[PDB]
Homo-oligomer: A and B are copies of this chain.
Amino acid sequence: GSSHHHHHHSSSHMKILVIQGPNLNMLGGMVTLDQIHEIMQTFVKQGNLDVELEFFQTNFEGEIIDKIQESVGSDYEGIIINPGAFSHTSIAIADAIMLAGKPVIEVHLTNIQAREEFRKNSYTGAACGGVIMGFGPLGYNMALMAMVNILAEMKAFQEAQKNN
């Protein structure tokens, strides 16, 4: 699958991993995925945020399981995923996620509540703590704004108990 990433300088620093599910490579709303990624980057460079993104799209469920598994070599501290149609079917990823080790957030462009009966459950989303759907590309940024706060708060907490 496909993979973009930007760099980051070196003076906290939060590495985040975005995983885009099958067919998401194809948007082209009238907006494209690369565009959804600059929107994300634009919203960080902009928010004033020491966040590094890694972007990842694939059509292969195994490639999505692999990628999560990699992350567990503690690099990035959280995952933003839109499993595509795998949301509805794939227990195997739901499992990947539950032994992800870190925050995961599911994001869906459409409102899957409001579509075909079959799209209504996501197993994957049941396993991410949080789920965003319905918002169009705008949803990713919500997942980003959220991710930031989660991690932040965790850092402030790991520094909480680890003194006494």
Contact = CB atoms under 8 A, between A and B. Distances in A.
Interface of A: 21-23, 25-26, 58-63, 65-66, 69, 72, 84-86, 88-92, 94-96, 99, 105, 111, 113-114, 118-123, 125-135, 138-139, 141-142, 145-146, 149-150
> For the complex, would chain A's binding face be called helix, strand, loop or mixed by DSSP majority?
helix
Contacts of A26: 69, 72, 96, 99
Contact of A111 (B95, B123, B129, B142): B129
Nearest to A65: B59
Given A69-B26, A84-B95, A92-B59, A131 B111 contact: yes
Nearest to A99: B26
Contacts of A146: 135, 138-139, 142
A134 B125 CA distance: 9
B130 A134 contact: yes
Contacts of A119: 91
Contact of A95 (B23, B105, B135, B138): B23
Contacts of A69: 23, 25-26, 59
Of A25, A63, A65, A66, chain B has the most CB atoms within 10 Å of the CB of: A65
A92 B62 contact: no
A115 B37 CA distance: 32
20 contacts: A23-B96, A26-B96, A59-B61, A59-B65, A61-B61, A85-B95, A89-B90, A89-B92, A91-B118, A105-B134, A111-B129, A111-B131, A120-B120, A120-B121, A131-B131, A131-B132, A131-B134, A141-B145, A142-B145, A142-B146
